Every structure is written in C-alpha cells, then in structure tokens.
Structure 1
Amino acid sequence: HMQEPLKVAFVYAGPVSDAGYTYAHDQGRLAMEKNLGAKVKSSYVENVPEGADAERVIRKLAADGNKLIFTTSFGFMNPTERVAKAFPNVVFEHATGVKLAKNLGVYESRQYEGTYLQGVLAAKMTKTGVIGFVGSFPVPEVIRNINAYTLGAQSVNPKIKTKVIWVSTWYDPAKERQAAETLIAQGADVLTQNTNSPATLQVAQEKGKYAFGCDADMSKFAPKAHLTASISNWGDFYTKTAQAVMAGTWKSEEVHWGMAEGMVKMAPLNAAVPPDAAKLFEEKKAAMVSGKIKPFQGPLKDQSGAVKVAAGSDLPLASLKGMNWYVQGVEGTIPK
C-alpha cells in the first residue's frame, strides 16, 4: 500500500498565461494533481524553445529524477526521441508526434471534430461567404483543421471559400493580431486559428466580425465575437497515463481521443447564433459524438480534383496521420 510519489514533468512551448493551448495542457496537469493527490509530484517548464534548448530542458528533467515526462509541442518531437534513447527507465509522452520507442508514446486530440462543427456555424454566420484560418506551420494537425473547417462550412454552403494565412509560429500575439487583420482586410468574416492566443478573437471583436476560441473558452476576451470554442480536456489522459506508470501497466502506443472520449468539448453558443443555426449545430454535434458523421467521410477531392475518398468510405488513419493536401475551396492570402 506504500509507494514513493511519481515525479511527473511537463514541457511547454508557450506560457501558462497564453489563455489557450498551454493554459489547457497546464489545466490537465492540475487535474492530474487533483485526481492523484500525494501519489504524484508535478513540475513544468514554460516558454521552452525548439531544438538544442528543448533537448537541454528535457535532459535536465530526466536527470532530476522525473519518471514520466510530457513534451506538449510538435516541435519537441526530435529532442524527445533523443532524450528517450538516453533515459530508458523514464516514460516519455510526446503530443502530436509520429515517433515511438519502448519508452516513448505519442498522444493527440481529434480537435478537427470540433473544427468541423465550427465550420458548420461559420457557414451560417458569414456574410461574405469567406471564412479565415490563422495557421502556424503546415503539419498534419493544422492541415486536418483547415480541411475540417472547410468541409464543415461546405456541408451548409458548398460555395464557401477558406482563406489561410501562415505566421510560422504557434504563439505570437502580435503576429496573430496582424494575421487576423489581414484575413479581415481580404474579406474573411468568421475566423479560426491553430495558434495559441486570443488575439484573433480580439481583432474580430474590434472589426465587428466573428471568431472561435481554441483549446479554452476565450469568450471573456471577445464576448461579441466568440461564437464557441473547441475546448481541450487533457486531464483524464494525463491522469490515466500517470496511473499506468505507477501501476506498471504503461506501454508505448499512439493515443487519439476526441469528443466521444471527452478530450474535445464545445463551449456554449454565442447569443447571436439564431435558432436554425443552433439546432443544426446541436444535431451535428450529437452525430459527431456518436460517429454517425466523421469529418473526413467521403466523397472528398483534393484541390487538383483527385478523389481521395469515395462516397460511403472514410479517410484511412494513414492518410489522416500524414495529411498534406487541401480540399477544394482552400486558398492562401495575398502576401504583404
């Protein structure tokens, strides 16, 4: 019945005060601490850059006696794989990665389920017929979200166009704000983002447009603009993983949880959403949870007109994992 506390560390690419992505991972850590109490001792490091700095931070946490380390950014993938080889008695969990080892697992959300529902609402609320996406880097997570936003919108209005702008960072509130201003200048009036700040929401509110929270309810930053949010609940996953390491049941695997598992939840609808739109949103949400609809159910074509998925089929897990193609109706912004 007696066992020393499990030392668990979290490595963040951003600040806990982003009120988005890192905030939600850190709420997951705090949920793990509440659920497991004295059986776990957690620590975290914020604002860890990619490459040599990340490797040095992850090594130091492994050297300090942490037995379970979560690296919560795509950009920590190669540093995590190198430190895992050097620390074969430490369990490593890497968010959104594709590299596994005996002591390295990977985990991610199916947030694109929520992004699909956002696109349904964006189609109902847009006046220009142009929706906007602030992207970080063209990795499969982000391209799945761009496509899911577009397909969700197209389920309501097949003529919808999605304009994408890239900021080449996950988190920079000044760059995110400039990117949101550019999308609105180029005719987008309902915005979503894969970056980590509420900057896009604040710009939407200032310009009288709409946007969506990402990873947390961001309505306090922009009560008029915030239609809803795709909330990320990491707490149950972090709890289960820490429990597995303590109990000796942990094994390397690829974990993907969505709305059915409670990792992805939608915030309440803005009062501006009319009853016809709200009703459709609740019906599609129920269908998403039950698996009666899937964001990448066929038929799908890419932007060259190639068939990716036939009607009555679903996109295979391999194509989801490596997604680097766009559906018809996705375009870039004019640069400068």
Structure 2
Amino acid sequence: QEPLKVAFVYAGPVSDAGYTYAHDQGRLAMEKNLGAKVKSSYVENVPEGADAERVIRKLAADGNKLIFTTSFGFMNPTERVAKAFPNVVFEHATGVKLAKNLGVYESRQYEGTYLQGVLAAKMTKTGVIGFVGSFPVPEVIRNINAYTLGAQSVNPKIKTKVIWVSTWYDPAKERQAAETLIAQGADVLTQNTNSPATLQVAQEKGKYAFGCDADMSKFAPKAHLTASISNWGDFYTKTAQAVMAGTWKSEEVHWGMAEGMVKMAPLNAAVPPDAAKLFEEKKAAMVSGKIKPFQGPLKDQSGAVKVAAGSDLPLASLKGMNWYVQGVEGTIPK
C-alpha cells in the first residue's frame, strides 16, 4: 500500500511548550510507531472561521486521507469540509459534531485537574485558588469545576477565582491574567490556555502553578507543583492504523488516566509528605475508577442538586457542562 497521508491542523505554535506541543509530540509518536506507512504534515497558528476552512480544504485537496483538527474553534469549518470530501477521514478534537467521515476525540483532562485541586488545597496559604480561562465551553467549565471539587475534597471552604482571556494562546494576555489573579489573592494557579506564562508569573511572585498538557517545570522550577500531561500518540497511531486497515468508523472517543492519555508529572520537592501521600492515594483511585471527579453529591451555585450522593454525573451533562459548583467566582474586572 501507498503511504497514508495524514495532516494535523493546529490553532497555536508547536513552540507553545503546552497544548500544541503535546499534539505535535503525538504526531511524532505516530510517525515513530508507523514509520514509512504514514507521511504526516502539519500547519500551525491557524485562526478560526474562514482561514481554518481554507487550510483544512487545501490539505484535503492535496491528497491527505486523514486530517486531525486539534482545536474546538475548528468544529464548524471541519464539518463543512468533511461534507465536501467524503473520501477523507476527519477527526475533530473536543467537538460534538459527527458525520459518516467525521469523528470526535478528547481527553478526560479534568481527572488530572481534580488531582491538581487536591494538591492546590494542601499548598494554598490564602484558601483562594485561581484559574486562567480561555472561553466558557464545556472542556473549560469541566476543568474549573474539577479543580474546585478536588480542592474542596481537602478544604470545603476553598474558593476558586476565574479570569477569562478570550483566547486559547496569548502569552502576554495569560501573564496579565495570572498577575490579576495573584493581586486578588489566588496563590495556586491553573489554566486552560496553552502557554507557560502563568507559571512564570507564579515563580516571579513566589506562588505556585501547574503545567498544562506538558511538563513545564523548566520554565518555573520553584512554582511548578506538577502538570496534567496529554499523551495523544497512542490515539493518533490507533486512528491512522484503522484508516490504513479499513476498520475506521465515526465515533466519539474520550480517553483518560486509565487509557494513558492523561498522566501527571512528578511532584515538586516543596510538596510535604502528608500532601504527597494523599496525592498518590487519590491518583491511584482516579486511575482505578474508585473515585470520579463528578461523583455526587454536587450542587450548582444556586443550590440546585445536579447529582445525588452515590450517583455520577451523566455523560450528557458532562458533554454540555455550562454550570459551576459552589465556590467558583469571577475576578473584579481591571
């Protein structure tokens, strides 16, 4: 068989050392695993809307038979190109739109974020943890709520302050947002943006933060408590193999810590032994499915019950999550 032409569309740069870096490490793992059977290429820094549609269409027109579109913002462009290219397989990250030649895939990174919350509660001195958000889409709201629930499993009085930058990647805006969270009393920060900017600010101010999608400890060795690492390579390999073998079908795929898509970086030396022990126990329980981030009981911020004790939040509620747990608030606007 001719080598399978595979293309990756990134919303950011491979030099983000975060989200796009991790997707690109997955492409390179697919190339290592499948060798001469695959020929990969990529496009970085692709904007949303008309630009994304033009890039995706050009890759399909040039003979790519499998195209990964790695941003939420590529959802509608991917759906429109997939209709025009019925002999090409499309895989869209974090989306909810499917077709005969369009699948969707995502990680359960919120499993990792829950464990970051457990550690944040152990390491905070203010009792206020902070979150740099991109856009209020379900991926990000699940991470905000999981961070908060993980912290509240240690200290039920924890408060989570959220600031929004309306971008997935802008190191200058991310830095400003991290400065504002620390000014408003957050002392352990996480994010759903894509740069190490928040970590660099945390180190400058003597605060803590987490790496996102990759180990970011080299950017901020004193501030980096751990990181929720995204391993896409096994998924990209499996998908490329399926297309080559004629077994591919449209489905919604979500992998977490049990499937190896989500891993934690080693703990910072500053984490005391009581905190490290709890973290390792909760990590083992998360991998085994003994605990789930959205196990009941859960209430929203209006006091409405979302999940009773002894139940887990349903898949439909996870997929569309647009509500907050008690203790989530915004920053005062600058």
The one-character-per-residue Cα deviations of 1:140-164 (angstroms, maximum 9, x if unpaired) are 0000000000000000000000000
The alpha-carbon deviation at position 47 of structure 1 amounts to 0.1
The one-character-per-residue Cα deviations of 1:78-116 (angstroms, maximum 9, x if unpaired) are 000000000000000000000000000000000000000
- Gaps (5+ residues) in structure 2? none
The alpha-carbon deviation at position 324 of structure 1 amounts to 0.0
The alpha-carbon deviation at position 57 of structure 1 amounts to 0.1
Could you tell me how far apart the structure 2 residues matched to 1:241 and 1:286 are?
28
The alpha-carbon deviation at position 55 of structure 1 amounts to 0.1
Query: Which of 112, 115, 122 matches 2:113?
Result: 115
The alpha-carbon deviation at position 194 of structure 1 amounts to 0.2
Residue 118 of structure 1: SS of its match in structure 2?
helix
Matched with 1:251 is: 249
The alpha-carbon deviation at position 130 of structure 1 amounts to 0.0
The alpha-carbon deviation at position 265 of structure 1 amounts to 0.1
The alpha-carbon deviation at position 171 of structure 1 amounts to 0.1
The one-character-per-residue Cα deviations of 1:242-298 (angstroms, maximum 9, x if unpaired) are 000000000000000000000000000000000000000000000000000000000
The share of aligned pairs that are identical, in percent, is 100
Residue 333 of structure 2: SS of its match in structure 1?
coil
Tell me the TM-score normalized by structure 1: 0.99
Could you tell me how far apart the structure 2 residues matched to 1:16 and 1:214 are?
14
Residue 87 of structure 2: SS of its match in structure 1?
coil
Could you tell me how far apart the structure 1 residues matched to 2:186 and 2:66 are?
43
The alpha-carbon deviation at position 17 of structure 1 amounts to 0.2
The alpha-carbon deviation at position 66 of structure 1 amounts to 0.1
The one-character-per-residue Cα deviations of 1:18-56 (angstroms, maximum 9, x if unpaired) are 000000000000000000000000000000000000000
Residue 169 of structure 1: SS of its match in structure 2?
coil
The alpha-carbon deviation at position 306 of structure 1 amounts to 0.1
The alpha-carbon deviation at position 119 of structure 1 amounts to 0.1
Tell me the TM-score normalized by structure 2: 1.00
Could you tell me how far apart the structure 2 residues matched to 1:240 and 1:201 are?
33
Could you tell me how far apart the structure 2 residues matched to 1:190 and 1:330 are?
14
The alpha-carbon deviation at position 211 of structure 1 amounts to 0.1
Could you tell me how far apart the structure 1 residues matched to 2:139 and 2:168 are?
12
The alpha-carbon deviation at position 124 of structure 1 amounts to 0.1
The alpha-carbon deviation at position 137 of structure 1 amounts to 0.1
The one-character-per-residue Cα deviations of 1:296-315 (angstroms, maximum 9, x if unpaired) are 00000000000000000000
Could you tell me how far apart the structure 1 residues matched to 2:282 and 2:35 are?
38
- Gaps (5+ residues) in structure 1? none
Residue 276 of structure 1: SS of its match in structure 2?
helix
Matched with 1:263 is: 261
The alpha-carbon deviation at position 169 of structure 1 amounts to 0.1
Query: Which of 148, 151, 171 matches 1:150?
Result: 148
Could you tell me how far apart the structure 1 residues matched to 2:123 and 2:46 are?
38
The alpha-carbon deviation at position 165 of structure 1 amounts to 0.1
Could you tell me how far apart the structure 2 residues matched to 1:335 and 1:169 are?
17
Could you tell me how far apart the structure 2 residues matched to 1:34 and 1:265 are?
21
Matched with 1:43 is: 41
Could you tell me how far apart the structure 1 residues matched to 2:117 and 2:134 are?
19
The alpha-carbon deviation at position 331 of structure 1 amounts to 0.1
Matched with 1:135 is: 133
Matched with 1:194 is: 192
Residue 5 of structure 2: SS of its match in structure 1?
strand
Residue 318 of structure 1: SS of its match in structure 2?
helix
Could you tell me how far apart the structure 2 residues matched to 1:261 and 1:317 are?
18
Could you tell me how far apart the structure 2 residues matched to 1:60 and 1:118 are?
40
The alpha-carbon deviation at position 136 of structure 1 amounts to 0.1
Could you tell me how far apart the structure 2 residues matched to 1:85 and 1:267 are?
40
Matched with 1:102 is: 100
Residue 137 of structure 1: SS of its match in structure 2?
coil
The one-character-per-residue Cα deviations of 1:53-73 (angstroms, maximum 9, x if unpaired) are 000000000000000000000
Aligned length: 334
The alpha-carbon deviation at position 207 of structure 1 amounts to 0.0
Residue 226 of structure 2: SS of its match in structure 1?
strand
The alpha-carbon deviation at position 139 of structure 1 amounts to 0.0
The alpha-carbon deviation at position 193 of structure 1 amounts to 0.2
